[PDB]
Design a protein around this ligand. Structure first.
Ligand code: G
Ligand code: MG
Ligand code: MG
Ligand code: MG
Ligand code: MG
Ligand code: MG
Ligand code: MG
Ligand code: MG
Ligand code: MG
Ligand code: MG
Ligand code: MG
Ligand code: MG
Ligand code: MG
Ligand code: MG
Ligand code: ZN
Lengths: 166, 275, 148, 214, 130, 291, 108, 152
RNA sequence: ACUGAACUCCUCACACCCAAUUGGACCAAUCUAUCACCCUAUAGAAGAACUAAUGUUAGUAUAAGUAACAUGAAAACAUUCU
């Protein structure tokens, strides 16, 4: 097995100078051996990635699913964690950056089919990972406009050159 | 475990290689790295670029004033290179201006000196010196060394070379190396300009001719999003330059640039530098 | 493979051709040992040719470690700092001499595919071709089928 | 709930009886706290009782080593040298000193000492402590120091390294006399109420009220 | 976000919105009853090969029919509520085989419509259509 | 120059506020208690001159930060970016409450504020502007007004529809930048030195200084533009969704001092309007206000 | 029927990542003024609904012990009474039940 | 295909659908409140409406007596029906019940809805209240109402 | 007259394009003998090398998150109802 995700919180950056950019404090948290399929909550992870936490609390708790109850209790327990012993000023002015899922220690059993044949039934356990970062969330990159289309094509016609020649 | 340790040995070399690529350490001076002798390196370096003179003049050039501050600081807890760099950059400026104006009498003193300031700049001089291993011999406080400090050490070597060999050998050195970097870039790549047609009409009045007029000679794709115009500048119904461009304005200023090159004699088809 | 390997346009280090030529090999660092049967080629090479190699090339600097090593190595860095190590394990003195000679000959840039076998700094004389080089103009500057 | 859960779970065990006993190096708590003001015979007996266990013992020079141990023990917190701090600091004083500083560094410089550190009283243990005895000393300290704690990401939690500020503390030391290798080590602080509070934290906080159910 | 009109107003104001908007529709329809009092376009008589604009109606059911000979004929009903004209084109902005007009169906609520389509009806003068 | 005059005001406003938070001590603390039907019992340990109610709401939940427009400090409104200077009771309120009238009045002043900003910045640059104030009107007025006086050469001329549409798209651009209302408490001697030129702002400041016993007056800045307001204002510009000028009218003492006054209508994002109900509100605002 | 080639990961990845298989974010949430938490618009406040449900169960507990068994439902109205209240002249004829608590403000 | 069909399917036939519905409103009449799936109660509304509508006729109507005798098997609420619920709405004609959606059930995540007769005795639910009239939009709508009243 | 090859010529280097089958020049990893000592040399020995047997064992994908499975209803969760 591997448990590096807990060790990611143990790092300590050196002291920062007065005249330098304020760093956004990151923080990690996860839950282990949940009873839910890896690909199922990965949809939920695809929803929340790229928004605010309190706005994210609204979506999943109304989402009629079992995983949401499992990945909400990991969220606000990371919220009060980050403020109590990681020096986070606002419990709301932060944004999740990396939310993923992964397989866990599975368990194999037998399902009884007809005519004596057997089917190996795999029970699914998973590990859910979440990363938090302070500051407001970044805005979504809007679709590239016609000016971006035009300039990129003119840059292509300007960047090209003769080939197989002097 | 299956027997054998040869495979496990080379695997550790592969592990540390990946650990190097993942989290490489910061770079350091070659003096800090092993297999280094100071006196033998400047001597071997002097033979590389074909120069021979006293080590007292060499060491005084490579030594900076900043390292002396850290040297005496660590001593509590010798000779700078200001004079050598001063005479070095002084002779370089006069010598570069000499060969350039002898080859191009039409270039004015303003633009010809900006080119000399560019070749003697930081990005050009340090790039030549970085690719000549001057960074390994120079010693300072912080690493990577600043460009201004490395620039001072380069001209300091020119100063020590001037005092020992002479102007003719120092002339051959700065002439050969620096001009070869100038071969690539044309005039208005390093020497940017504003109002080229305004400067053109100013120069043409010095040369005693009339005010030219810009006229599109050929056209293509005008209404299309890819306009194309061949603008030519004529005076007394006689042409001097023709310049393409996106729009009429881009073709006009380009045609003004084309005349400025041939007026000062910096055409791409001019006589290369002899040796 | 060309596509799997990177590539480059041909170029020399700071235009070493026009001006005074400089041997672009900066340093050689030999790693030999007082023992190990594989080091017979390197040690005998150190005896005979490394002396004459230094007399032939005063510019290049040479270092020899002479420490315990199961395999001898030879490290070579150039003016640009490009380090290139090659294994001289179980090699004859004649091969090592030709190997060190070509190392002295080559420059400090990684051996990869070349996009083309030459490089021209001023390729254009008489003006490079544009579509309007080989066609005439029109009286009064008129496009086809245009009155004024 | 430990005994009740052991009953209901069924993890019955006998009492752990063994010839071995857990040997300590510091008594938990204190014997007598000096009630400070708003600003004796037992002391001399406790002083000379320490001399009966170690005749080569002085009082006039103790405040010197007390301040010497003070600045170097806190310099070890900056360097995070736990090995030296353990031999210089008791096992009751270690958690309260080194627990909350996890996930953060610390900076502590000593400017000077306005007033000299002065012994306040000396107290001593009885014989009924695992067949051992432990003495204690109290020392007032009035100096000026700087404090600046940076979190995991290197931003100051509070305090500035440049400005010092006056401070008053009543340090408590203790030593194991049964063995000879025992040495004086910081034990606890009296932290009286009448003393003023330290500087607040630049960051703002809240509290969650009583979570009222339906 | 996305919301609707009925959310953010009081219960006493909802009937005010209903009767006012309905009276606006009746006022717009009542004004456009007589186009002759306004300016009409030039009228021309029918010629061979010409055509006539159709219309839109509303089917409300079916019923039977009988003739003078007693023979039965099933027949539908098609009702026309408002059916106003909406646009005119030339056979040369359209560049088609023939010029085109536009015709509307029945009036519906002005609330469930698009802004670009709604302002088109405002300058037109009539209420929206199906 | 009118442009250099604007940066001159902004510089002095930076001089004034810099004196304020530099004068107040450092590491100050105050215990502000929360009051309201929602989440009572909480008390926040906040700063005296750098903390704000918007920061307090962000500790609690961003849902209030998006919904909070003002706050009640001991029974009187408060601007979301103005720092509370003592321990007190705090309660945030929104548009949908039992008595949101004070929030509307702040919006009435807010929408009345930057209407004066865009019109006097839009000016056709040689013309001058000698704006007077943003007159206070009740909620039943149906439109926010802003009085102004103008040169005499264009006295007979009134702005056309295309001139109105120009101001609307400009105002739509201002809100898109999400300008926050930076407020400040200043002295009458200070505020008169900012608006020493425009006489109509001079005597308006003496009027406020006369109404105030201590003569202290509050000030609100719209980016480069600055203006006085009687009551608090909304936190951000972006929360007003649709915003446009209705008409213009010009009041009988015209020749001694022309009284022009524009008129518009708008509403927040929390309750957006439909095209139809929005249209009947336009022709309501196009009419004249009696006052 | 049976497969014939292993579905690659890139085509498997594209199938499960298309927008319809993903859940659609909804801008249809607002704060409940009564409880302070969130609630869908067409749905009632879950907190206050649980408050009403559990209290009504306790009122159902009260009439149960009073009636004392099944098939004891009377044929008259009923009115709840809390501490600090007496029967009014209107509900004097209506059935009344005692209860030990304070009058909630949300309840009329 | 289905077009214009007002009824929907509940379970294992006509025998099943009304019988479980019958047990549902049978419990509604005694509690005057019930929580249940949305589609089930959506059908029960029309049944409860016609039930009390004919309950106004009184116990003298032998027809309605046999009907309520069938609808209710406990037999105790039928006297309660004619004597309590019918006088409760003898003046009120239509719209007897209020129906709002509630959150889903715990385990199966099925949509649920609550029913209750108006003027009930037990405490009400937190219904969705319309926004206050003191809002600016309501005041603007209140504004021109006087303008039109002043003009006309 | 042109286009046009691993044919031919040209600068340099050449043992470096046939199935089965035969002969040769080298060699990975391993143990031992002896050197060596950030991993190698000279010899011998062998359970001495796997892109393939509807191969064996184990792990994980594809089919697929598909086929398939489940709790009569109400509520005080006491009881009542189908
Ligand atoms: N699914 C998956 N997760 C990975 C992989 N590598 C790393 N991770 C996740 O990222 C965490 C941090 O890994 P390092 O930063 O590489 C791990 O603890 C694990 O959760 C990988 O190959 N697959
Ligand atoms: Mg299988
Ligand atoms: Mg069914
Ligand atoms: Mg050959
Ligand atoms: Mg064959
Ligand atoms: Mg080998
Ligand atoms: Mg084998
Ligand atoms: Mg294998
Ligand atoms: Mg098979
Ligand atoms: Mg097959
Ligand atoms: Mg196989
Ligand atoms: Mg399928
Ligand atoms: Mg099925
Ligand atoms: Mg079944
Ligand atoms: Zn609520």
């Amino acid at each position: 097995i591997s448990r590096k995700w807990e060790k990611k919180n143990k790092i300590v950056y050196p002291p920062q100078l007065p005249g330098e950019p304020r760093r956004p404090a990151e923080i990690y948290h996860c839950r282990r051996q949940i009873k839910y399929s890896k690909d199922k909550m990965w949809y939920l992870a695809k929803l929340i990635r790229g928004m605010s936490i309190d706005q994210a609390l609204a979506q999943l708790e109304f989402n009629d699913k079992k995983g949401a109850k499992i990945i909400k209790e990991v969220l606000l327990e990371a919220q009060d964690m980050a403020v109590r012993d990681h020096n986070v000023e606002f419990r709301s002015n932060l944004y999740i950056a990396e939310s993923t899922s992964g397989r866990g220690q599975c368990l194999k059993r037998i399902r009884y089919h007809g005519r004596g044949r057997f089917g190996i039934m795999e029970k699914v356990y998973c590990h859910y990972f979440v990363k938090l970062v302070e500051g407001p969330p970044p805005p979504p990159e809007p679709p590239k406009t016609a000016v971006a289309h035009a300039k990129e094509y003119i840059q292509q016609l300007r960047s090209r050159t003769i080939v197989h020649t002097l | 475990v299956k027997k054998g340790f040869r495979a496990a040995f080379r695997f550790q070399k592969e592990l540390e290689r990946q650990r190097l690529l993942r989290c490489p350490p910061p770079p350091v001076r070659r003096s800090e790295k092993p297999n280094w002798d100071y006196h033998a390196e400047i001597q071997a370096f002097g033979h590389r670029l074909q120069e021979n003179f006293s080590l007292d003049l060499l060491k005084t050039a490579f030594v900076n004033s900043c390292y002396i501050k850290s040297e005496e600081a660590k001593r509590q807890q010798l000779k700078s290179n200001q004079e050598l760099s001063e005479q070095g950059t002084s002779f370089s400026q006069t010598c570069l201006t000499q060969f350039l104006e002898d080859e191009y009498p039409d270039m004015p003193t303003e633009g010809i000196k900006n080119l000399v300031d560019f070749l003697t700049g930081e990005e050009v001089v340090c790039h030549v010196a970085r690719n000549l291993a001057v960074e390994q011999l120079t010693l300072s406080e912080e690493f990577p060394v600043p460009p201004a400090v490395l620039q001072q050490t380069f001209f300091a070597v020119i100063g020590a070379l001037l005092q020992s060999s002479g102007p003719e050998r120092t002339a051959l050195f700065i002439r050969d190396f620096l001009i070869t970097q100038m071969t690539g870039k044309e005039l208005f790549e390093m020497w940017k300009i504003i109002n080229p047609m305004g400067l053109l009409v100013e120069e043409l009045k010095k040369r005693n001719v009339s005010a030219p007029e810009s006229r599109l000679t050929r056209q293509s794709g005008g209404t299309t999003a890819l306009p194309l115009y061949f603008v030519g500048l004529y005076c007394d119904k006689k042409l001097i330059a023709e310049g393409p461009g996106e729009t009429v304005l881009v073709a006009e200023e380009e045609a003004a640039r084309v005349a400025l090159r041939k007026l000062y004699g910096f055409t791409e088809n001019r006589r290369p530098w002899n040796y | 493979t060309a596509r799997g390997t990177p590539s480059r346009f041909l170029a020399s280090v700071l235009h070493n051709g026009l001006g005074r030529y400089v041997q672009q090999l900066q340093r050689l660092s030999f790693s030999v040992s007082r023992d190990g049967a594989s080091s017979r080629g390197a040690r005998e090479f150190v005896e005979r040719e490394v002396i004459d190699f230094a007399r032939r090339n005063p510019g290049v600097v040479i270092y020899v470690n002479s420490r315990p090593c199961c395999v001898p190595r030879v490290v070579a860095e150039y003016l640009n700092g490009a380090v290139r190590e090659e294994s001289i394990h179980c090699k004859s003195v004649e091969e090592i001499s030709t190997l060190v000679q070509k190392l002295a000959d080559q420059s400090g840039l990684d051996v990869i595919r070349i996009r083309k076998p030459f490089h021209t700094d001023n390729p254009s004389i008489q003006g490079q071709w544009h579509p309007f080089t080989n066609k005439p103009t029109t009286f009064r500057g008129l496009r086809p089928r245009e009155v004024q | 709930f430990a005994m009740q859960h052991a009953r209901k779970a069924g993890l019955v065990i006998p009492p752990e009886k063994s010839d071995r006993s857990i040997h300590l190096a510091c008594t938990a708590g204190i014997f007598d706290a000096y009630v400070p003001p708003e600003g004796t015979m037992a002391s001399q007996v406790s002083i000379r009782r320490i001399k009966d266990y170690d005749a080569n013992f002085k009082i006039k020079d103790f405040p010197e080593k007390a301040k010497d141990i003070f600045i170097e023990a806190h310099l070890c917190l900056n360097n995070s040298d736990h090995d030296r701090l353990h031999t210089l600091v008791t096992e009751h004083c270690f958690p309260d000193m080194t627990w909350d500083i996890k996930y953060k560094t610390v900076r502590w410089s000593f400017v000077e000492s306005l007033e000299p550190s002065h012994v306040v009283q000396v107290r001593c243990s009885s014989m009924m402590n695992q067949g051992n005895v432990y003495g204690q000393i109290t020392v007032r300290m009035h100096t000026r120091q700087t404090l600046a704690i940076y979190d995991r990401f290197g931003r100051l939690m509070y305090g500035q390294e440049d400005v010092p500020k006056d401070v008053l503390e009543y340090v408590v030391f203790e030593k194991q006399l049964t063995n000879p290798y025992g040495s004086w080590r910081m034990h606890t602080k009296i932290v009286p109420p009448w003393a003023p509070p330290k500087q607040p934290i630049l960051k703002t906080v809240m509290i969650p009220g009583p979570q009222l159910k339906p | 976000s996305g919301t609707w009109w009925d959310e953010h107003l009081s219960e006493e104001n909802v009937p005010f919105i209903k009767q006012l908007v309905s009276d606006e529709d009746k006022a717009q329809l009542a004004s456009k009853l007589c186009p002759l009092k306004d300016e009409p376009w030039p009228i021309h008589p029918w010629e061979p090969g010409s055509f006539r604009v159709g219309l839109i109606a509303l089917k409300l059911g079916m019923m039977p029919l009988w003739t003078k000979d007693g023979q039965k004929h099933v027949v539908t009903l098609l009702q026309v509520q408002d059916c106003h004209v909406l646009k005119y084109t030339s056979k040369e902005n359209c560049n088609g085989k023939m010029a085109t007009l536009s015709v509307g169906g029945k009036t519906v609520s002005r609330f469930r419509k698009a802004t670009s389509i709604l302002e088109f009806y405002r300058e037109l003068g009539l209420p929206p259509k199906q | 120059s009118p442009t250099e005059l604007t940066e001159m005001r902004n510089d002095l406003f930076n001089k004034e506020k810099a004196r304020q938070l530099s004068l107040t001590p450092r590491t100050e603390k105050i215990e502000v208690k929360h009051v309201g039907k929602t989440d009572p019992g909480t008390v926040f340990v906040m700063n005296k001159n750098i903390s704000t109610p918007y920061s307090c709401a962000m500790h609690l939940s961003e849902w209030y930060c998006r919904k909070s427009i003002l706050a009640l400090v001991d029974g009187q409104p408060w601007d979301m970016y103005k720092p509370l200077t003592k321990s007190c009771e705090i309660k945030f309120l929104t548009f949908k409450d039992c008595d949101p009238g004070e929030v509307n009045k702040a919006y009435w002043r807010s929408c009345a504020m930057m209407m004066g900003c865009v019109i006097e910045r839009a000016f056709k640059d040689e013309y001058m502007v000698n704006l007077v104030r943003a007159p206070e009107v009740p909620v039943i007025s149906g439109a926010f007004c802003y009085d102004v006086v103008l040169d005499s050469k264009l006295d007979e001329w009134m702005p056309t529809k295309e001139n109105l549409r120009s101001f609307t798209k400009d105002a739509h651009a201002l809100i898109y930048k999400d300008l926050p209302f930076e407020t400040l408490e200043v002295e009458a001697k200070v505020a008169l030195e900012i608006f020493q030129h425009s006489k109509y702002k001079v005597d308006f400041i003496e009027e406020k200084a006369s109404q105030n016993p201590e003569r202290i007056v509050k000030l609100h800045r719209i980016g480069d533009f600055i203006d006085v307001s009687e009551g608090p204002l909304i936190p951000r510009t972006s929360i007003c969704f649709q915003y446009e000028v209705s008409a213009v009218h010009n009041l009988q003492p015209t020749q001694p001092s022309l009284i022009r006054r524009f008129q518009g209508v708008s509403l927040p994002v929390h309750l957006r309007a439909h095209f139809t109900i929005w249209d009947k509100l336009l022709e309501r605002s196009r009419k004249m206000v009696t006052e | 029927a049976a497969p014939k080639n292993r579905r690659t990961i890139e085509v498997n990845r594209c199938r499960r990542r298309n927008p319809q298989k993903l859940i659609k974010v909804k801008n249809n949430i607002d704060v409940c003024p009564e409880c302070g938490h969130l609630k869908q618009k067409h749905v009632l406040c879950a907190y206050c609904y649980e408050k009403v449900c559990k209290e009504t169960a306790e009122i159902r507990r009260q009439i149960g012990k009073q009636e004392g068994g099944p098939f004891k439902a009377p044929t008259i109205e009923t009115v709840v009474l809390y501490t600090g209240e007496t029967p009014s002249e209107q509900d004097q004829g209506k059935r009344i039940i005692e209860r030990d608590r304070k009058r909630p403000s949300w309840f009329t | 295909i289905s077009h214009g069909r007002v009824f929907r399917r509940m379970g294992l036939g006509p025998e099943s659908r009304i019988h479980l519905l019958r047990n549902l409103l049978t419990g509604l009449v005694r509690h005057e409140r019930i929580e249940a799936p949305w589609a089930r109660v959506d059908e029960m509304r029309g049944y409860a409406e016609k039930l009390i509508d004919y309950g106004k006729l009184g116990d003298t109507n032998e027809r309605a007596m046999r009907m309520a005798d069938f609808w209710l098997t406990e037999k105790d609420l039928i006297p309660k029906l004619f004597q309590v619920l019918a006088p409760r709405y003898k003046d009120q004609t239509g719209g007897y019940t209020r129906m709002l959606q509630i959150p889903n059930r715990s385990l199966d995540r099925a949509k649920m809805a609550v029913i209750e007769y108006k003027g009930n005795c037990l405490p009400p639910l937190p219904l969705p209240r319309r926004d206050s009239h003191l809002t600016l939009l309501n005041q603007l709508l209140q504004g021109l109402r006087q303008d039109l009243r002043q003009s006309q």
